[PDB]
Design a protein around this nucleic acid. Structure first.
Ligand SMILES: [Mg+2]
Ligand SMILES: [Zn+2]
Ligand SMILES: [Zn+2]
Lengths: 194, 290, 105, 77, 1116, 91, 151
RNA sequence: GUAGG
């Protein structure tokens, strides 16, 4: 992790210089070594997740309670306007509303209905700042967890059938991009632990 | 004290007595599981457990010999120490100091050593097993195929479908009897290939790549004969496997039972997995050229 | 056996060599079809003829019976049973009940 | 003339699930395959194909054909 | 003059120094080891030239260091004065054919001398056949060609390290002395503000006890060390005093459990460190330590001295004190600093000679202990040098090194280049060195000392990234074991025609300039500003006359393989690595052609490799035939070179050899007479050159798949021979002998149709899967004929005979014509191993044509699997009707950042169609005219040195001035793109397309090898689960991740069958097979066996693993 | 299959599992290549190497399976029983 | 919230996006146990991991018995530790550790209930996930009477 | 060991 005072001054069209080429291989070999290690570590991590994530299978049609989770439906609302959350998709889409929402004295989104583009856009237009979505964390199921709390499956785009193994799909999704991450601090900066 | 309470209560609630700490009669592995299988060339193949058992029984014999006659305390005590060393090496070789290196090039295997780790029993021969009715080959790109079609080479197909092609050949009277059918398929006549072309359709095959990061590794497809010696594959699904075409061998399996092929047609079919399970977006629409 | 052969993944040399005690399903099912066809072909013959040949070759029980040994339960004399065994040899050796069994060897 | 020829959505709405559809179609496929493999006993419990069939056919395809027709019915014990 | 065929050169700078012999590394090292006439001749040549060189041969040295053995009485001695060799008994061809280790006799004159007898008895004795290495460089053992690869290991020396401990919040300094052979010792200063010793890291202790145990007194100790407070604190806190007290205390600590003994402890210390035999410091180690510690001429060979220990202590304390320059103990002033292990001033290479010498040394150590034991148990006057020595350890050790040793590797023979490369590798993996699990980030990465000592570009891509690397182009080996690099001398700003060889530490002091830097017409620099490199890998420039050394050739950092790739400068290193790794796998073809565009060094790479056959004399050829070529020098010596023809290589490719020279043509020494595989006119040719165009095409080149015309299938342009050889053995078993015969039992007639009289396949008879090659029958076996089979025999009247068929058959999925058959027999004069009575080898050969599935790749790393071969018409053909022979997906070349190939393709089109440049007055035209590459006829090859290649301006000008191929029109546009007419539709393509000629290589990852299938096959004995591998019909393993995916799908039943029915359940396999053949439905699965085996294993360990049901016991 | 109870195996349990015991380090004869007596690979405790074939030549047939011949005491059965049967060593 | 935010921002650093339910399942898993404190009335040890369900059952039992409950504090441990301390010995053995888990199971004399997946892939029975569930598999199949009326 | 993934 040491930057050079004299950077490369030529394009691969123009053709590097011999010294420049030597300096380039420095980083490239290091990157290759890092990838070989990152793949190994990612495989290990995936095994740990999938083993710890087992035994979580959907074994009930509908939850027993009503307690939900508070999520920010819209954020960074500039002055005189309402702006939806930047990364709303990963968070609140495909989630089950624990209870109905009334903003003008009329129900807008009915309960136990998944949320897509149209419904979220409507709620944002109405101007509600937050939302209460059902989720596994507050789920109260005598056996495992219920289908409603986990909400619709992303892959099938439909409500999760009973008996689906959610743990293994969770582990696989978490583990797959580990090889793709390949992120590291560019330079220690000459300081350790900062 | 808290740690001790745990163990004593565990002993007390269990009906078994603690005296099992001191085993007296050492079991022995059944002979087959530790085979002294004959090897061509006058040589022999032996599992190290045979050597460990030889060591322990030999030392027990010598201790019996000493105890029979009047012997000093030093020698009998050393002998009992030796017996304890042999037994411990049998259960665990290398749990204390240098292991019993046996031939000297490497340590000797032990029972516990067999049940542990990457090469152990559990993680290599109970959660992953080799399987009959499978194959492997390089995979090449064939555009004209449909989303449900993959091109199996001829030889791989015929080897894969030997019971079925044989059954149809005898049923169609192309072969006289079963032995004649086997000889016929081994010979490889055009009639065999035609029967095969008849039997493969409407029978799923699971294509599958090696890393299998996420559930889009295993994908069912309809078979379809094609010349050459390489699997063909539908270019849209390639990015689900993360499979490039520099060169990449992809395994093929068969759902043998009726229930298995029902699962292949309904669940693992290649036309019902457009969306990557991670975040709910299209994944089966690659982008390199089209 | 527990020696490294080639790479660590290849591991023990034990894996490389096949066994012999394994029942090859191909040969076993070949034998089963041979058994079924042979029993059917015997049933093609007369009841007594098939029975005497089966006892002469132990098709019901692992030990074949000698000619005189067949002439106790059936009540036939050793030469009578010898004669009809020869006639069964004649009856089976026709081209009729031979095409199916030729391919089984 | 292919796996996808019976579309899945009708079967799904018929059986109200994905896995129940699999086990149910597989049970029907097993039943019909047992029927064709009778070779002479003629057991009354066994039932022939309700839909027309080809000279050579995979049983589970006929099972799925029956389900898509919707004529065959299921009921849990 | 006529060394190589003419090839146009685009080089811009002249190269004074010629590349050395590419294979010097192995041949010269083994030459030193043997100490034959060649080594001594080279030694005297160096001496008269003034060059330093070890004057003592290896073998005689290892004999000499073994002192004559002395008993407890010291009465007797054995002197091993002179060693010698004899010519090998077996010819190299004979050794290869008959499976004999190519060795020679090695004798030595042992002289017995006993003072009690007062007599000297000389006798010559023979230690054993010594594995020799042939001139081509490979150890022939057991008929196979193996090679020992050089090993990178840290040199013996004193190594200093600095680090930071977060808990301490302060710097920590340590030192370690790495001996060549002895036990290791370390010296850590201020771990907790105090200094301490690590005598093999046995127990905690101080330094004061050590010094006190030595003869050095506290008074002189503090006098020398009164200037640094840390040592004073250590001394004062040390309560113990006196040499005896410290000595007994350290002895107790090292070996507790017994009362201390003064003399025993003293002898222990002498043995550990002062004993010459026990502590061994190589000459290199001694050489290194003195420079590091600055001691002026210590003992040239000898163990460490207390002087050395105190000097290291002084260096360590000076370093921790913050002082950076200090007087060396009994030496000149020196910088005191920490040193990085990565720098090759500390790294060293163990060439083949030193490795073999080390194993011979171990063997002679075994011999010494054995003979000492014998003398301790032998009577006087009955002792002879012939009788007392046992030669078993030496022969066994050298044998144990060439078989079953990582550094002794199978010689790849895919092509000459893979040859040379596997010769020159520096395998850091190995015994007494860095291991795979031991690897870290630091060792793998490149270091600024790599220039000239290792090609940083190329290495295996697998987990052993960078650990293995090829030698640099000009690298030569320091006699100690470092790698030197040649540098041109620079004085007062003029480059001089003198070369000096500099090592990994000498190079640091000076400043090294750049080769590509321009020079004036005179020897002075054209520009005051010149880029230079300096200590620590710094790249700062220094204008004006300041440098003293500069690189001789631009390609100093690139090994041979990486030096092949033209236009490397324009390539990302990642893809250059891919290409270099993929340049060692090209298979030769029927007809080889040198590349049209490529580096000008390929000729040397082909020449030095032994595949080519060159003449040793300068005469007139007398007879030219395929089998043999006869030459006659003017002196009168006649020599007939026998050309190997269609003999299997290591990887199974033909080693066919052509002939080039005519009948009466004059020859010169070293001139090439016959090309080897993948060779043409003495030049490397690893593939062919195809006309090629960049454009997508109906997805048949999607994701970098390739499309190639059927014309390559038509003209055998890409066709490779493949020779497979496998054998069978007749062995006398317990029951009886096995027989080879045409009378195979229980078979048809036509199967044994083409066989020989004795039951062997004739020559020329094509074979298929199931064909009988050699008929073999078991002697007998106990046959209890079954009731059903009994009846069947009775009906058909056939006799089942105890002899059983065990004949050889073609393994499944094969094809070929038999080309040769060899038989060895016991009773005949030929020797065989025990038991085996006759051995038969059969050669089956085919001509694999380029087909779908064959891998294929360009030099720059564009590799793909052929996905379709259209007829010659569907090719998008060009204006004059020339079809394109291969299509490529352009989407690669931006993302892969490897635009070298576009330069290559344009230059290839340029090379195919000659150019004329005369009187153009253009800068590029002037550059070609001065270079001389102005007038070029079509098809004549060209050279683009790796870093002095063609500039884009030159390409543009030449393209604008290409000779008209036809109709007086230039067919490619100045842009480098031409008009393509679609073959299928016929409409001209909307815009022009790029087209040219690029070299392409047929790799050895062929489909035919990889293809595999299994209905049902053999099974493993310990656990019934099917075995693996292709040679034994193994089914593909179902991995744990695989079952996780299946669990995710929820498809339980498919998992259940894939786990139980299709393997791991003996009772279910036969049942399912009968069910499928009978058409009956599949039965319910049974319990797997492996759980049963596991249960027995847990039960064997006193764990009562009991399967129990909810209602009492369970049923299984 | 309902539960895999595991726990301490007492000496009585090991004796109960054992169908006999082992007394020698003998494995096979160098010449007959056959199992020795009362040692490792001892057919008298584990089982016949060949299917329904005893050691002493007395019985080699499948018909009269399920019996012990007093000559070598081998219980004629399928060879697979060797994969299951186990003995013990007394210290 | 902190865990989901941290992991999500790390992933979004590259750009890959993962739905938050997947994380929520794992974070639920890591939080499952509770460290018991003041285990006077409950009669088991103080200061050890206990399953949340087990803790609730014990507290309900003791309060029903009239004695005051023993206290508990939610405690977080890495996935490895929670995985090892699982009621299923077979699954834990199938994990990285064998000798210790085999030993402590043996001394404990704990019978493995086969509820779960990995242990049921060991025995080779049908996994209770997807097609293998009891409700799905117990169905019986027969056509309608009008079917036989037609043919 | 060494190549490909
Ligand atoms: Mg790949
Ligand atoms: Zn819920
Ligand atoms: Zn017997």
């Amino acid at each position: 992790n040491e930057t050079i005072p004299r950077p490369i001054k030529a394009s691969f069209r123009e053709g590097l210089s011999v010294l420049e080429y030597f300096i380039s291989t420095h980083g490239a070999r290091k990157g290759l070594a890092d990838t070989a290690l990152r793949t190994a570590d990612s495989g290990y991590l995936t095994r740990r997740l999938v083993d710890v994530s087992q035994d979580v299978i959907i074994r009930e049609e509908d939850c027993g309670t009503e307690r939900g989770l508070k999520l920010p439906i819209a954020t960074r609302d500039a002055d005189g306007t309402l702006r939806k959350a930047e990364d709303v998709e990963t968070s609140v889409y495909a989630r089950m509303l624990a209870e109905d929402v009334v903003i003008d004295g009329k129900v807008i989104a009915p309960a136990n209905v998944d949320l897509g583009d149209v419904l979220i856009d409507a709620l944002v237009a109405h101007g509600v700042e937050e939302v209460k979505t059902r989720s596994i964390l507050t789920c109260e199921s005598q056996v495992g967890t219920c289908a409603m709390c986990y909400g619709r499956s992303l892959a099938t785009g439909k409500l999760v059938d009973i008996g689906e193994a959610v743990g293994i799909i969770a582990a696989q999704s978490i583990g797959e991009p580990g090889t793709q991450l390949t992120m590291r601090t560019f330079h220690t900066g000459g300081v350790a632990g900062d | 004290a808290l740690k001790r309470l745990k163990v004593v209560s565990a002993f007390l609630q269990t009906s078994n007595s603690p005296k099992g700490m001191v085993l007296d009669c050492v079991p022995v592995i059944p002979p087959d599981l530790r085979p002294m299988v004959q090897l061509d060339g006058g040589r022999f193949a032996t599992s190290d457990l045979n050597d460990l058992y030889r060591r322990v029984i030999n030392r027990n014999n010598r201790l019996k010999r000493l105890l029979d006659l009047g012997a000093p305390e030093i020698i009998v005590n050393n002998e009992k120490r030796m017996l304890q060393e042999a037994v411990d090496a049998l259960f665990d070789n290398g749990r204390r100091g240098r292991p019993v290196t046996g031939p000297g090039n490497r340590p000797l295997k032990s029972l516990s050593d067999m049940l542990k780790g990457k090469q152990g029993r559990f993680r290599q021969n109970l959660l992953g097993k080799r399987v009959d009715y499978s194959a492997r080959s390089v995979i090449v790109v064939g555009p004209q195929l449909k989303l449900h079609q993959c091109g199996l080479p001829k030889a791989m197909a015929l080897e894969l479908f030997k019971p079925f092609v044989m059954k149809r050949l005898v049923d169609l009277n192309h072969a006289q009897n079963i032995k004649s059918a086997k000889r016929m398929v081994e010979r490889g006549r055009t009639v065999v290939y035609d029967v095969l072309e008849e039997v493969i359709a409407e029978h799923p095959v699971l294509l599958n790549r090696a890393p299998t990061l996420h559930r889009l590794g295993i994908q069912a497809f309809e078979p379809q004969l094609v010349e050459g010696k390489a699997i063909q594959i539908h270019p849209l699904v390639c990015t689900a496997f993360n499979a490039d075409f520099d060169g990449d061998q992809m395994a093929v399996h068969l759902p043998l039972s009726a229930e298995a092929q029902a699962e292949a047609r309904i669940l693992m079919l290649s036309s019902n997995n457009i969306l990557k399970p991670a975040d709910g977006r299209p994944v089966t629409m690659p982008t390199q050229d089209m | 056996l527990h020696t490294p052969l080639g790479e660590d993944g290849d591991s023990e040399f034990g894996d490389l060599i096949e066994d012999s005690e394994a029942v090859v399903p191909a040969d076993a099912v070949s034998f089963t079809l041979l058994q079924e066809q042979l029993h059917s072909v015997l049933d093609t013959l007369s009841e007594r003829e098939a029975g005497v040949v089966s006892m002469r070759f132990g098709l019901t029980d692992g030990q074949p019976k000698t000619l005189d040994e067949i002439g106790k339960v059936y009540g036939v004399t050793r030469e009578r049973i010898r004669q009809i065994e020869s006639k069964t040899m004649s009856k089976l050796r026709h081209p009729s009940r031979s095409q199916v069994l030729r391919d089984y060897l | 003339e292919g796996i996808i020829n019976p579309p899945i959505d009708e079967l799904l709405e018929a059986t109200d699930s994905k896995y129940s559809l699999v086990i149910y179609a597989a049970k029907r496929a097993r039943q019909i395959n047992a029927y064709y493999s009778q070779l002479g006993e003629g057991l009354l419990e066994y039932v022939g194909p309700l839909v027309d069939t080809h000279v050579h056919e995979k049983p589970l395809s006929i099972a799925l054909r029956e389900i898509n027709a919707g004529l065959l019915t299921s009921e849990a014990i | 003059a006529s060394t190589a065929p003419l090839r146009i050169s685009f080089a811009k700078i002249k190269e004074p120094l010629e590349v050395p012999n590419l294979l010097a590394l192995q041949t010269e090292s083994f030459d030193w080891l043997l100490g034959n006439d060649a080594w001594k001749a080279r030694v005297e040549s160096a001496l008269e030239s003034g060059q330093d060189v070890p004057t003592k041969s290896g073998l005689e040295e290892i004999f000499e260091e073994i002192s004559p053995i002395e008993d407890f009485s010291g009465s007797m001695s054995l002197t091993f004065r002179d060693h010698r060799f004899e010519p090998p008994k077996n010819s190299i061809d004979e050794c290869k054919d008959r499976d004999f280790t190519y060795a020679a006799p090695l004798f030595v004159t042992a002289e017995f001398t006993n003072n009690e007898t007062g007599e000297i008895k000389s006798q010559t004795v023979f230690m054993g056949d010594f594995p020799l290495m042939t001139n081509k460089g490979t150890f022939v053992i057991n008929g196979t060609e193996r090679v020992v690869v050089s090993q990178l290991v840290r040199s013996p020396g004193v190594y200093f390290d600095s680090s930071i401990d977060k808990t301490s919040d302060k710097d920590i300094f340590s030192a370690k002395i790495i001996p060549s052979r002895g036990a290791w010792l370390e010296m850590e200063i201020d771990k907790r503000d105090m200094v301490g010793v690590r005598i093999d890291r046995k127990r905690k202790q101080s330094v004061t006890v050590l010094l006190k145990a030595l003869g050095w007194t506290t008074e002189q100790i503090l006098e020398e060390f009164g200037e640094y407070e840390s040592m004073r604190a250590t001394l004062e806190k040390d309560h113990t005093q006196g040499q005896d007290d410290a000595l007994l205390d350290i002895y107790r600590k090292l070996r507790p459990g017994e009362p201390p003994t003064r003399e025993a402890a003293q002898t222990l210390l002498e043995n550990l460190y002062f004993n010459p035999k026990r502590y061994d410091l190589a000459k290199v180690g001694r050489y290194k330590v003195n420079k590091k510690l600055g001691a002026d001429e210590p003992l040239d060979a000898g163990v460490l001295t207390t002087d050395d220990v105190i000097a290291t202590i002084k260096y360590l304390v000076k370093l921790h004190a913050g002082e950076t320059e200090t007087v060396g103990e009994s030496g000149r002033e020196i910088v005191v600093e920490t040193d990085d292990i990565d720098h090759f001033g500390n790294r060293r290479i163990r060439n083949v000679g030193e490795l073999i010498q080390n194993q011979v040394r171990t063997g002679l150590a075994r011999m010494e202990r054995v003979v000492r034991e014998r003398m301790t148990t032998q009577d006087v006057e009955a002792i002879t040098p012939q009788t007392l020595i046992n030669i078993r350890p030496v022969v066994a050790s050298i044998k144990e090194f060439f078989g079953t040793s990582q550094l002794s590797q199978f010689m790849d023979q895919n092509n000459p280049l893979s040859g040379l490369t596997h010769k020159r590798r520096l395998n850091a993996l190995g015994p007494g060195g860095l291991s795979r699990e031991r690897a870290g980030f630091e060792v793998r990465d490149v270091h600024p000392s790599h220039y000239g000592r290792m090609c940083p570009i190329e290495t295996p891509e697998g987990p052993n990234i960078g650990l293995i690397g090829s030698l640099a182009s000009y690298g030569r080996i320091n006699p100690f074991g470092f790698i030197e690099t040649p540098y041109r001398k620079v004085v007062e700003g003029q480059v001089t025609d003198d070369v000096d060889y500099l090592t990994a530490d000498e190079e640091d002091r000076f400043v090294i300039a750049q080769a590509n830097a321009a020079l004036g017409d005179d020897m002075r620099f054209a520009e005051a500003r010149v880029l230079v490199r300096r200590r620590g890998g710094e790249v700062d420039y220094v204008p004006g006359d300041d440098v003293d050394y500069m690189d001789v050739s631009p390609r100093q950092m690139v090994s041979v393989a990486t030096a092949m790739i033209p236009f490397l400068e324009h390539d990302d290193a990642n893809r250059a690595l891919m290409g270099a790794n993929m340049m060692r796998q090209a298979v030769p073809l029927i007809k080889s052609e040198s590349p049209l565009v490529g580096t000008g060094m390929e000729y040397r790479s082909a020449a030095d490799a032994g595949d080519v056959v060159k003449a040793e004399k300068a005469g007139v050829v007398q007879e030219v035939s395929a089998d043999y070529i006869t030459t006659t020098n003017d002196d009168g010596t006649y020599i007939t070179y026998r050309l190997a023809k269609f003999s299997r290589s290591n990887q199974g490719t033909s080693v066919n050899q052509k002939v080039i020279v005519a009948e009466g043509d004059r020859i010169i020494e070293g001139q090439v007479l016959a090309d080897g595989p993948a060779t043409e006119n003495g030049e490397m040719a690893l593939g062919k050159n195809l006309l090629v165009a960049f454009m997508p095409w109906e997805g048949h080149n999607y994701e970098d798949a390739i499309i190639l015309s059927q014309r390559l299938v038509q003209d055998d342009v890409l066709s490779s021979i493949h020779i497979e050889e496998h054998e069978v053995d007749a062995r006398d078993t317990k029951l009886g002998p096995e027989e080879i015969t045409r009378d195979i039992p229980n078979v048809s007639e036509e199967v044994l149709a083409d066989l020989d009289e004795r039951g062997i396949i004739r020559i020329g008879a094509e074979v298929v899967a199931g064909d009988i090659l050699v008929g073999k029958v078991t002697p007998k076996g106990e046959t209890e004929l079954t009731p059903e089979e009994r009846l069947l025999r009775a009906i058909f009247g056939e006799k089942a005979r105890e002899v059983r068929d065990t004949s050889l058959k073609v393994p499944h999925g094969e094809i070929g014509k038999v080309i040769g058959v060899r038989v060895f027999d016991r009773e005949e004069g030929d020797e065989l191993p025990p038991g085996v009575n006759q051995l038969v080898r059969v050669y089956v050969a085919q001509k694999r044509k380029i087909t779908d599935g064959d891998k294929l790749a360009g030099r720059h790393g564009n590799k793909g699997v052929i996905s379709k071969i259209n007829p010659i018409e569907d090719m998008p053909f060009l204006e004059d009707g020339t079809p394109v022979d291969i299509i490529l997906n352009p989407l690669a070349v931006p993302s892969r950042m490897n635009p070298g190939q576009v330069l290559e393709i344009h230059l290839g089109w340029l090379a195919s169609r000659g150019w004329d440049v005369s009187g153009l007055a253009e800068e590029w035209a002037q550059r070609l005219q001065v270079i001389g590459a102005d007038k070029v006829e079509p098809g004549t090859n060209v050279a683009t040195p790796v870093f002095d290649g063609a500039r884009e301006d030159e390409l543009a000008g030449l393209l604008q001035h290409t000779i008209p191929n036809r109709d007086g029109e230039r067919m490619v546009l100045p842009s480098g793109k031409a008009r393509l007419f679609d073959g299928r539709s016929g409409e001209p393509f909307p815009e022009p397309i790029s087209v040219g000629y690029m070299y392409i290589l047929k790799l050895h990852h062929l489909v035919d090898d990889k293809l595999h299938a299994r209905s049902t096959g053999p099974y493993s004995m310990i656990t019934q689960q099917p075995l693996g591998g292709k040679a034994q019909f193994g089914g593909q393993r179902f991995g744990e991740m695989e079952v996780w995916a299946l669990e995710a799908y929820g498809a339980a039943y498919a998992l259940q069958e894939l786990l139980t029915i299709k393997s791991d359940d003996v009772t279910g396999r036969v049942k399912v097979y009968e069910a499928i053949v009978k058409g009956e439905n599949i039965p319910e699965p049974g319990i797997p066996e492996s759980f049963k085996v596991l249960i027995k294993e847990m039960q064997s360990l006193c764990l009562n693993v009991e399967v129990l049901s909810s209602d009492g016991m369970s049923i299984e | 299959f309902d539960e895999l109870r595991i726990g301490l195996a007492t000496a009585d349990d090991i004796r109960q599992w054992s169908h006999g015991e082992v007394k020698k380090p003998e494995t096979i004869n160098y010449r007959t290549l056959k199992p020795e007596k009362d040692g490792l690979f001892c057919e008298k405790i584990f089982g016949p190497t060949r299917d329904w074939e005893c050691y002493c030549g007395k019985y080699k047939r499948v018909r009269f399976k399920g019996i012990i011949c007093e000559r070598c005491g081998v219980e004629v059965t399928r060879a697979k029983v060797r994969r299951e049967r186990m003995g013990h060593i007394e210290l | 919230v902190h865990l989901v935010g941290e992991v999500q921002k790390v992933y979004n650093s590259q750009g890959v996006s993962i739905h938050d339910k997947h994380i929520e399942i794992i974070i639920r898993q890591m939080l499952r146990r509770v460290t018991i404190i003041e285990s006077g009335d409950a009669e088991l040890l103080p200061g050890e991991l206990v399953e949340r369900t087990k803790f609730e059952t014990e507290n309900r039992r003791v309060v029903q018995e009239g004695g005051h409950p023993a206290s508990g504090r939610p405690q977080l441990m890495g996935i490895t530790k929670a995985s090892l301390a699982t009621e299923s010995w077979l699954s834990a053995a199938s994990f990285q550790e064998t000798t210790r888990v085999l030993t402590d199971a043996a001394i404990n004399a704990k019978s493995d209930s086969l509820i779960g997946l990995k242990e049921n892939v060991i025995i080779g029975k049908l996994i209770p996930a997807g097609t293998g569930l009891s409700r799905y598999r117990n169905i019986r199949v027969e056509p309608t009477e009008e079917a036989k009326a037609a043919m």
